[PDB]
Amino acid sequence: AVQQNKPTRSKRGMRRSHDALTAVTSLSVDKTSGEKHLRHHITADGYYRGRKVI
Amino acid sequence: MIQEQTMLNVADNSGARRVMCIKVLGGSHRRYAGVGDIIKITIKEAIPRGKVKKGDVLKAVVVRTKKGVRRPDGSVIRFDGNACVLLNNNSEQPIGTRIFGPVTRELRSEKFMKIISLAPEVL
Amino acid sequence: MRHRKSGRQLNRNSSHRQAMFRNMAGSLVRHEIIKTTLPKAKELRRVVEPLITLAKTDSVANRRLAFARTRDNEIVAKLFNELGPRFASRAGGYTRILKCGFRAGDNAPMAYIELVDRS
RNA sequence: AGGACCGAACCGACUAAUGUUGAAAAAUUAGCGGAUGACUUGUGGCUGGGGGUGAAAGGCCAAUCAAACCGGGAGAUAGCU
RNA sequence: GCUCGCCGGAAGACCAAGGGUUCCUGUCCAACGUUAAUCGGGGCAGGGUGAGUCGACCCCUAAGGCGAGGCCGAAAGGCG
RNA sequence: ACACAGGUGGUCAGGUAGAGAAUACCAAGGCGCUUGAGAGAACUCGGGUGAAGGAACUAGGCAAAAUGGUGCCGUAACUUCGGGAGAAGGCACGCUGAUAUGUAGGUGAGGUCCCUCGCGGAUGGAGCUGAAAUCAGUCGAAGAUACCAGCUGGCUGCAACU
RNA sequence: AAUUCCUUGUCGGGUAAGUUCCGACCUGCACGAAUGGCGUAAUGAUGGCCAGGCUGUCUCCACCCGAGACUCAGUGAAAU
RNA sequence: GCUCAACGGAUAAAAGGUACUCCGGGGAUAACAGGCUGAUACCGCCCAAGAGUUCAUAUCGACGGCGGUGUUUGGCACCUCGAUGUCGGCUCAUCACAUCCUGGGGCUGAAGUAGGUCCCAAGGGUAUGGCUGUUCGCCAUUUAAAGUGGUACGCGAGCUGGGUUUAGAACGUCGUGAGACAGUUCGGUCCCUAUCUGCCGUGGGCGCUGGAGAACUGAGGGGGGCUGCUCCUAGUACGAGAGGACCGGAGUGGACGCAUCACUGGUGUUCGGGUUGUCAUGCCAAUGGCACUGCCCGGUAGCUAAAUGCGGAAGAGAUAAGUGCUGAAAGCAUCUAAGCACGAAACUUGCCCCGAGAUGAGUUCUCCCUGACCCUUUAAGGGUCCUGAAGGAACGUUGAAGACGACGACGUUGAUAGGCCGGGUGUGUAAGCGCAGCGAUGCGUUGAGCUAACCGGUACUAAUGAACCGUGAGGCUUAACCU
Ligand SMILES: [Mg+2]
Ligand SMILES: [Mg+2]
Ligand SMILES: [Mg+2]
Ligand SMILES: [Mg+2]
Ligand SMILES: [Mg+2]
Ligand SMILES: [Mg+2]
Ligand SMILES: [Mg+2]
Ligand SMILES: [Mg+2]
Ligand SMILES: [Mg+2]
Ligand SMILES: [Mg+2]
Ligand SMILES: [Mg+2]
Ligand SMILES: [Mg+2]
Ligand SMILES: [Mg+2]
Ligand SMILES: [Mg+2]
Ligand SMILES: [Mg+2]
Ligand SMILES: [Mg+2]
Ligand SMILES: [Mg+2]
Ligand SMILES: [Mg+2]
Ligand SMILES: [Mg+2]
Ligand SMILES: [Mg+2]
Ligand SMILES: [Mg+2]
Ligand SMILES: [Mg+2]
Ligand SMILES: [Mg+2]
Ligand SMILES: [Mg+2]
Ligand SMILES: [Mg+2]
Ligand SMILES: [Mg+2]
Ligand SMILES: [Mg+2]
Ligand SMILES: [Mg+2]
Ligand SMILES: [Mg+2]
Ligand SMILES: [Mg+2]
Ligand SMILES: [Mg+2]
Ligand SMILES: [Mg+2]
Ligand SMILES: [Mg+2]
Ligand SMILES: [Mg+2]
Ligand SMILES: [Mg+2]
Ligand SMILES: [Mg+2]
Ligand SMILES: [Mg+2]
Ligand SMILES: [Mg+2]
Ligand SMILES: [Mg+2]
Ligand SMILES: [Mg+2]
Ligand SMILES: [Mg+2]
Ligand SMILES: [Mg+2]
Ligand SMILES: [Mg+2]
Ligand SMILES: [Mg+2]
Ligand SMILES: [Mg+2]
Ligand SMILES: [Mg+2]
Ligand SMILES: [Mg+2]
Ligand SMILES: [Mg+2]
Ligand SMILES: [Mg+2]
Ligand SMILES: [Mg+2]
Ligand SMILES: [Mg+2]
Ligand SMILES: [Mg+2]
Ligand SMILES: [Mg+2]
Ligand SMILES: [Mg+2]
Ligand SMILES: [Mg+2]
Ligand SMILES: [Mg+2]
Ligand SMILES: [Mg+2]
Ligand SMILES: [Mg+2]
Ligand SMILES: [Mg+2]
Ligand SMILES: [Mg+2]
Ligand SMILES: [Mg+2]
Ligand SMILES: [Mg+2]
Ligand SMILES: [Mg+2]
Ligand SMILES: [Mg+2]
Ligand SMILES: [Mg+2]
Ligand SMILES: [Mg+2]
Ligand SMILES: [Mg+2]
Ligand SMILES: [Mg+2]
Ligand SMILES: [Mg+2]
Ligand SMILES: [Mg+2]
Ligand SMILES: [Mg+2]
Ligand SMILES: [Mg+2]
Ligand SMILES: [Mg+2]
Ligand SMILES: [Mg+2]
Ligand SMILES: [Mg+2]
Ligand SMILES: [Mg+2]
Ligand SMILES: [Mg+2]
Ligand SMILES: [Mg+2]
Ligand SMILES: [Mg+2]
Ligand SMILES: [Mg+2]
Ligand SMILES: [Mg+2]
Ligand SMILES: [Mg+2]
Ligand SMILES: [Mg+2]
Ligand SMILES: [Mg+2]
Ligand SMILES: [Mg+2]
Ligand SMILES: [Mg+2]
Ligand SMILES: [Mg+2]
Ligand SMILES: [Mg+2]
Ligand SMILES: [Mg+2]
Ligand SMILES: [Mg+2]
Ligand SMILES: [Mg+2]
Ligand SMILES: [Mg+2]
Ligand SMILES: [Mg+2]
Ligand SMILES: [Mg+2]
Ligand SMILES: [Mg+2]
Ligand SMILES: [Mg+2]
Ligand SMILES: [Mg+2]
Ligand SMILES: [Mg+2]
Ligand SMILES: [Mg+2]
Ligand SMILES: [Mg+2]
Ligand SMILES: [Mg+2]
Ligand SMILES: [Mg+2]
Ligand SMILES: [Mg+2]
Ligand SMILES: [Mg+2]
Ligand SMILES: [Mg+2]
Fold first, then answer.
1. Do C101 and A48 count as a contact with CB atoms less than 8 A apart?
2. In angstroms, what separates the C-alpha of C40 from chain A's closest C-alpha?
3. What is the C-alpha to C-alpha distance for residues B9 and B41, in angstroms, rounded to an integer?
4. How far is the CA of C85 from the C1' of H297 (A)?
5. Which of A 7-46 lie inside 8 A of C, CB atoms?
6. Which of B83, B66, B106 is nearest to B11 (CA)?
């Protein structure tokens, strides 16, 4: 099963339109550390909801 | 659940012991046969001197089934083997005068009053 | 299909999944905190928390069953000595899952699973 | 004792399935036959193209064989595309 | 480093064929590894192969080749 | 042509079971085979199980399923008298104790006689190894309990057979 | 008949039913005696038929265990 | 001087095989297929000599004639040989009516059942086996019935390779021979990850003119429409008798589909237990690993069928064949020309589902922000500050929802998931101890121990305070009302 006519750049772009990326809606800030981390995840130092775990 | 090519024992004393079912009566695409369902069988193993011989083709009724019957309350009554009773192609009446083993109450009808009476036990 | 079922294959057979979970539970008991993928950290709770409730009642049969499950005397001894009285007041909840982020080699989610009474 | 038997190494490839722009330009798994003899294998040598070999299939002769490969005649010829 | 699994008449250890540094150390991460890589049989530099007793060399020949002269053949050459 | 599911000659041969270089689990030793994680749709491949029938499916019992080991009784037509034949079919198989505080058997010491006299022989059983068989009891649905491990018979054409 | 177009020649056996199988009839299109004929103990990864057991081959599929297929991260072709 | 006779004569002189085969080419030219016609094939119609006890036409139809389908065997060779893959079988269907059944009707040499012929009607259904590679066909037994044909003699980028059709070999026949036989026999590689149309399902964007959350109207589309047997009517009607009703009701079942796991069972390699070989935990005991889940025995939830509930409609409207009422043209007659009525599983509704992108973009109940500034291009204008609502989106716990998307529930004002308590179910007297037995082993503690997906509860843990998107009263013209 192979193609019979060469597709176009328009069709290629239409197909790739749904292949885009979605960025992060917003970031979270720790109450005491003031950093920026992902939602429900820990920071790069070991802070989560103000407490220290590392 | 009796179908074609199924091997059955014989409950009556007409001279047969092993029979092979070839058709199931009742309609089109009829494949399963329970108790009280008329089927057609051929004779594969028969006694030397009996009312029938080997190779005869005739109707029969099912009195015992390994699959078993199902009462309305859910009580299922099964057996350890599949046995049938021979009949006549025209009159559909039993040939032998005895019925070996027990039978089920889901068999009694105006056509089979001569089987339950001869059976020593009815369930 | 998968309806009302439980358990996760994790692209492994039973003989591998049981051994991996046993090793992970032993490491978690030994270190009080480990880092692993989120599904593994979630499925390890169902193996470790019953194992802690078993140690909550000290006896010979319980220790024998724990040894059958873990194959580590140095782990079962600690489980029956320290974790037992430590979690004797908690009605479950012997683990705490904190998301770590992702990974470089496969970009899989990562998380730290530890004991609630660690620090 | 046996061109004896069952069955491993070893040799071979009868059936099925996978694969067939394959792990592989003929293989993999489950089975299979011979397995002390007309057996198999290592090393070395010999038999060559109208010729060699062939328990004989038009089979093999360096993945190519109803006449091997390289160079030359040669820019063979082509009423054919 | 602590656990799990596998081969174990091998998926272990020596070799002859064959390959020709691929063996060890330091160092590197441009190209290679069907991904990354601090790693590697990948790049660079350095080091490493010690025999009267092992093998090759050497004595002797089998199949077989060459072949003084010799026989034969239009040349070449063939046989011995 | 590849860091390729292929091919390549010689030597060493451990233990428990076991007839064994078959097979299972392991020691010395060597590896997880250079992309992983996640959920667990259709569908493809390698498999497991299955209510009743049991080849009715299909060109065709293709494939799949099934017996499958030791000891013993016993085994037809036919025949070139060798065979068929492992014919077909059937029974025992675990463990404990006793027979026998480990038997039959095998190996075989110290100590005894002489002796050409030593790496010697008759006597002797110490010690070690060690089946198979019978009786009684016992546990499980199943004791050749796992891997490994013939399906069988009858008729017939062809080729004698390897 | 490994050979027979007419042919599924006719009868019998097996099957409830048998253009396949076996035993007979001979009307041999177009068997035939060392380009050999008849039969034949044993043997065939040989051709055909029947039977016992055996089973998802099926009646009619159902569930489960793993590898792919599905999503994410990296590398990244092809026939046309 | 040449039957150079192939006679304008290629040489004084010349036969065959290739399925071991090869090259250049041709759809200029072959077979399957497609195309044109329809000699043939099938079907329909016309006169009526007759058969039919008389009587042509209840039912057949000569000697003859006229037409339709393009379904067979065929004619031409127009497309394809710089490839359109072929018979049969399996799965999958769809359309047609010259209909096999069901439905309705006319005639009958139709007393009744059972029949024969013809018209309308395609809504539904339309068999399992032995033989053969076979379609076809023979036979066995059912069925209400086991339809006719088209779809490249439907369907190999869906499957199969039994035959036909390559290379091997053999038989019979022909050929002196290489070889040949739609004569036979044994065996003999069927590749493709879907680019576009199509189809089955699931989504993102935007629009529907302010935005958001919900419930619907239903234009339109899709699914189904099959029927046997017994009894009552009634052994009545009919018939001298065997025989045996139309219409109308009741019941139980076969094939098909939808839904479900309460029950009957399968699976249940995540539960329990038995047991063989081996290794390990210093050793006994007790366990773990491996040998298909090592081999097995049962089995929770879930998924399932073989299991159990349900459906095929009743009824209405307009109708075909058909039966009629009144009634003239034609003083009668006449179903028709005016008018009226009955009439089939055919049609539209009625039963179920999808469904306003139905751009003709629909309807209804609700909720939401009623702040100011300046600039040229004076407008459906551009920009600034403040504001960020209803609601949605994102992350997380997740689901009897699901390929990814999507949908549903929850998120500290909470039972969403995990864990825990109790219970339930399943497996089956756990380990340890003591007693009896030399011992294997049994007994009491003990229906004990364990218990996945189940139930009723429990914040013990994880679902965070936030942040983001989405705005700030909504264009022009006209009709009615209130100012
Ligand atoms: Mg094209
Ligand atoms: Mg895309
Ligand atoms: Mg759940
Ligand atoms: Mg994976
Ligand atoms: Mg295992
Ligand atoms: Mg031999
Ligand atoms: Mg060979
Ligand atoms: Mg072969
Ligand atoms: Mg093999
Ligand atoms: Mg073998
Ligand atoms: Mg052998
Ligand atoms: Mg050599
Ligand atoms: Mg040559
Ligand atoms: Mg030459
Ligand atoms: Mg040949
Ligand atoms: Mg070659
Ligand atoms: Mg060749
Ligand atoms: Mg030549
Ligand atoms: Mg020249
Ligand atoms: Mg040229
Ligand atoms: Mg192992
Ligand atoms: Mg081995
Ligand atoms: Mg090299
Ligand atoms: Mg180098
Ligand atoms: Mg190195
Ligand atoms: Mg280095
Ligand atoms: Mg880098
Ligand atoms: Mg790289
Ligand atoms: Mg490579
Ligand atoms: Mg290097
Ligand atoms: Mg030497
Ligand atoms: Mg010499
Ligand atoms: Mg000389
Ligand atoms: Mg010489
Ligand atoms: Mg590699
Ligand atoms: Mg290799
Ligand atoms: Mg060994
Ligand atoms: Mg799967
Ligand atoms: Mg199986
Ligand atoms: Mg089994
Ligand atoms: Mg079954
Ligand atoms: Mg069972
Ligand atoms: Mg069964
Ligand atoms: Mg059977
Ligand atoms: Mg058959
Ligand atoms: Mg059939
Ligand atoms: Mg087989
Ligand atoms: Mg064998
Ligand atoms: Mg004969
Ligand atoms: Mg024959
Ligand atoms: Mg032979
Ligand atoms: Mg002979
Ligand atoms: Mg003969
Ligand atoms: Mg014939
Ligand atoms: Mg006959
Ligand atoms: Mg014969
Ligand atoms: Mg003759
Ligand atoms: Mg002959
Ligand atoms: Mg002759
Ligand atoms: Mg002669
Ligand atoms: Mg002769
Ligand atoms: Mg001969
Ligand atoms: Mg059979
Ligand atoms: Mg993918
Ligand atoms: Mg390219
Ligand atoms: Mg002349
Ligand atoms: Mg002329
Ligand atoms: Mg050509
Ligand atoms: Mg043409
Ligand atoms: Mg044609
Ligand atoms: Mg065409
Ligand atoms: Mg007349
Ligand atoms: Mg034609
Ligand atoms: Mg062509
Ligand atoms: Mg072309
Ligand atoms: Mg072709
Ligand atoms: Mg009609
Ligand atoms: Mg219609
Ligand atoms: Mg209708
Ligand atoms: Mg048969
Ligand atoms: Mg066709
Ligand atoms: Mg086809
Ligand atoms: Mg095509
Ligand atoms: Mg063939
Ligand atoms: Mg031919
Ligand atoms: Mg002929
Ligand atoms: Mg495909
Ligand atoms: Mg949308
Ligand atoms: Mg259920
Ligand atoms: Mg339940
Ligand atoms: Mg059950
Ligand atoms: Mg089970
Ligand atoms: Mg169940
Ligand atoms: Mg064990
Ligand atoms: Mg022990
Ligand atoms: Mg191990
Ligand atoms: Mg009138
Ligand atoms: Mg009138
Ligand atoms: Mg109806
Ligand atoms: Mg209970
Ligand atoms: Mg007890
Ligand atoms: Mg136990
Ligand atoms: Mg106890
Ligand atoms: Mg008790
Ligand atoms: Mg519990």
1. no
2. 17
3. 11
4. 41
5. 38, 40-42
6. B83
State the first-to-last Cα distance of chain A, in angstroms, to the nearest integer. 56
Tally of domains within chain B = 1
In this structure, is the dihedral angle defined by the CA atoms of residues C35, C37, C38 and C44, taken in order, positive or negative? negative
CATH number for position B104? 2.40.150.20
Closest-CA residue to A48 (of B116, C104, C90, C114): C114
Amino acid letter for position B122: V
B8: exposed, middle or buried (Cβ count in 10 Å: 0-12, 13-18, 19+): buried
Closest by CA to A30, choosing from A44, A13, A47, is A47
What are the structure tokens assigned to C118, written together? 């660690």
Closest by Cα among C25, C108, C100 to A47: C100
Composition of chain A by helix, strand, coil, percent to 5: 20, 15, 65
Q: Tokens at residue C70, please?
A: 């873990």
The residue range of the domain holding B23 is 1-123
State the structure-solving technique: cryo-EM
